[PDB]
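Re: export button greyed out
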Amino acid sequence: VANDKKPSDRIAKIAETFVKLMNGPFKDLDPLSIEETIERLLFILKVSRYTLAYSDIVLHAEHNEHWYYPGRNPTEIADGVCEFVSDCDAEVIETDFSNLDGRVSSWMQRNIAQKAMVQAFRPEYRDEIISFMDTIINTTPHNTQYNGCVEFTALTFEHPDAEPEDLFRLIGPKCGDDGLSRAIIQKSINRAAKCFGLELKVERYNPEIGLCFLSRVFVDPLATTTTIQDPLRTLRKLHLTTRDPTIPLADAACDRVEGYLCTDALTPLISDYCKMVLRLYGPTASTEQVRNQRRSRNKEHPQDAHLMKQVLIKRTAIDEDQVDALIGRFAAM
Amino acid sequence: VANDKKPSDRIAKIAETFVKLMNGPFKDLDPLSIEETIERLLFILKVSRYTLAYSDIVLHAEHNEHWYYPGRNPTEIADGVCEFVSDCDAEVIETDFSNLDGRVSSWMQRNIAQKAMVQAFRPEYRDEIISFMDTIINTTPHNTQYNGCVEFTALTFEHPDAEPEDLFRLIGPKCGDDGLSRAIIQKSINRAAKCFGLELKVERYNPEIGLCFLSRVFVDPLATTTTIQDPLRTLRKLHLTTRDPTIPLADAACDRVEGYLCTDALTPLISDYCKMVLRLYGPTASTEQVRNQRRSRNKEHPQDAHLMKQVLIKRTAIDEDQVDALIGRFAAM
Amino acid sequence: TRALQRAVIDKTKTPIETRFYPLDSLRTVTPKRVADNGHAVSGAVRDAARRLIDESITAVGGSKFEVNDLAQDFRNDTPADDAFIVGVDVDYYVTEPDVLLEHMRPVVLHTFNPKKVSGFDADSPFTIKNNLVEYKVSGGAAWVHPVWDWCEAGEFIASRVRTSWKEWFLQLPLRMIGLEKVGYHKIHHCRPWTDCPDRALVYTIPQYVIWRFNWIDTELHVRKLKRIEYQDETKPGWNRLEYVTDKNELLVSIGREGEHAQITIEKEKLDMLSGLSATQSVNARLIGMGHKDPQYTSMIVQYYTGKKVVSPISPTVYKPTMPR
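Workaround output, generated via the alternate export path:
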């Protein structure tokens, strides 16, 4: 659903200041060769060749590590999240956007992303990048840029008397559709989204139900960095498999449970399901080398185990006796 | 809720006379250095650097001690209150303002506080102070200035034929949203507030229910200076804790009861609650050094014990047999 | 021409700013009604203006030099250099606004700049004859003074500056040639009272001084204050006035000189009516628009035909004054 909601006059100066702060000290850049782009990490290649270099140079710089979390290993993500929650003393807010790529306006697209790309890249490459942006208007970096712009707008609205550089220095971790911010702008974020024309969903941090971030649940971010898959999103749908019909059910289930072990080995109410899938569909599945040579293969802390159990129970609103009964039923099947 | 209710023509002369009497003999002043302001007692600093000096110089002078109680130790506050009640022979009135900072009008702000600050400070600092006031329009001293202005207006309306200096010399103790005044202007205070455009709440002093001042209850101000926390405001809400979720309940309760002991050690119906909190949440709480190193730590006369008990009963409208039953129930839990 | 280059190059300005604090309080002040009920009195309006200016000046913390003819004779009071100049209803007293503007200092002035060509200002009747306003102060004498055109387009002004007799001797040979020492000012007028739309709260700030050539034009076409010419050169014996409304309307006020009746009409309607061939057509069109009031259509017809009437000068009995 395309939208053409231009922002107000005042917000334009805030957006320009945010873009300039994003530019930082990297005035000049050069495009990457086709071979280097191909070995990095059709239609994706032509934009990737420039966008990967732009991200790696500007968005992964010294003065842009405060907010651009997108682009780091999951261990690095967990470390950053724990550091941010320690800094904010467990006072953080979560942002959940609905169809951001389907809702970003033309003015935002042509005044944030296009401006940033043109300022980052060399003048001799202006035509190619502008043509690529025009083709885009009619991937990953766009969401991060939108999140950074919205964070800058919120910070500018919260403290209009501070210098833009100091305001932007407080930008918290942001990664695409998910991000973190101070809880003091919980109500003012909705007005900023309305001014830009975006829809924002915000939820106050609650230790009883855990914290939601990148479909990951932090059981107790104050002390431990233990983290698990989001139970709210996956439990209601994990019993149904959305793989293509051509794949046997056993191979898809095996890949799903292998990923779950790789990410959620010691999570209550999921380990039992994964083990029962491995016990039932496991022997009936095909050879694992066969599925490793098949395209659809990629189409999918012990100390606080008690606390993780209680946090999962709080997340799923299931009584402990009910949880034990469910665990017994799952294991005995 | 911003308001633009300018006062009448006659009231302007009264306000100017009050401002001049506030000025007194301190014609010239100088700003404080940043280091001195920092060691005194961002955004707070820029206004504090001037307002702290202005308060200390003018509002803490010899000829301005009659009304500016705000800025003294609690023992000094109790001594001043007892002296004032002895002077007024237990004939005093209490003022309770609702959202004064959210209700002071533009005319009042630009003709009381701005005028006082400009007259107090040196001419070479006029631009900085006027800019700071303009930023404020679009902390503690403002409430005291408003209370003094309203007291001066009431005194001027009561005795329009006396000299302004003699009228102002009768200004009683005032401290922010709370203050004391003569009971002879109980009805005329409402008309003065209406003229300025402010809302005033006044209650006649009643020895049976005690006197309310700074959330403090004077059991018998005629003879003793014994004072306790306000029972009306705290009893209905002391059972619920408003601390942030990240703090454990035990630490917040321990800090609350430690403060209550520091202020209300020998108050009936509160000492038992504090002791039971210390008995229950005490052992289950964390280390006290840990909470002393934690940010949320600061986020919280035996001879007349009989009289204090009876005054608390009168304040809470609870029968003595009912009070004894409640005390027994609290202790035995 | 090459003469234009001379003026462009010859800046030779000496900006002077005695840290005159901008009085933002006077600028952007919402309209106010001084009288709760009925209509306000002239004394009440004067008191309100004085109170507003006093509050602004004291809040800014500056000083003032109130004026109550060519020279203000400020030496008898010797105010401070930074103090402002404040005058209220001093149109009769001051021969020219140049008298106030020579001091090269900010001026806050409350003046009579009518938008109606005749009628009542507050409780004070006023009328325009020749080009002088025959104001009749409620509770005062009769003032006869012109209007010095504060509200015309253009924020930049040209004015004289103080000069001693020795300075006069120095500059007279240069003055006769066409060389003048000219100061520049920035004007703001607010019009703060709705019930009395004929009085304007003029505000002024000086910017810088310059030496200019009399017989050479200016690129920015800066203007110097001139007496308003209310007389209508097309219809002798009539006064015509134009002003712009806040709702995007360009109204015009017409009336005879030394005369009381007065009507306001949209300018476009007056231009359409002034070209009609027959007098009866004027009435026909006016009835078509829906104007049934005889006092309106009759005056419009009289203006159309340019009817001159020699109204007499007669004794007047004024309302008794009450100090209250």
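Residues 31 and 50 of chain B are 6 Å apart (CA to CA). The button fix ships in the next patch.
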